[PDB]
Amino acid sequence: QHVDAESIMTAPKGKLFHLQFMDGLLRPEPSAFDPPASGEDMRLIYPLQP
Amino acid sequence: LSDDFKQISDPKGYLTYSVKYEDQFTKKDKLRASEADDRIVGPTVNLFK
Numbered sequence: 001q002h003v004d005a006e007s008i009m010t011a012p013k014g015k016l017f018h019l020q021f022m023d024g025l026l027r028p029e030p031s032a033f034d035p036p037a038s039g040e041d042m043r044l045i046y047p048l049q050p
Numbered sequence: 051l052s053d054d055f056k057q058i059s060d061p062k063g064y065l066t067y068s069v070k071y072e073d074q075f076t077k078k079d080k081l082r083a084s085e086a087d088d089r090i091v092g093p094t095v096n097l098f099k
Contacts, residue, residue, distance in 0.1 A: 035075065
């Protein structure tokens with residue numbers, strides 16, 4: 001997906017966009033040796049309620 | 051008279067380093083350092099990937 005903030009910010013007062021979180025818990029722990037990578041990956045929109 | 055000695059430029063030793071890479075990492079990207087120093091460091095680093 002990737003709700004582009006263009007719009008999450010300014011789109012009709014109705015529109016029901018389907019943003020989508022990740023569920024990292026079954027994520028693989030990078031091989032104890034291999035060299036690092038270098039872009040932190042973030043998210044700029046968090047749900048405001050549980 | 052006694053021709054016993056043969057001229058050479060870059061001599062080899064009766065010993066050397068032999069490494070074995072754990073091809074799992076390494077990248078094969080043959081690390082690229084500077085140019086001036088690529089030559090001095092040059093091989094040691096390529097060998098010690």
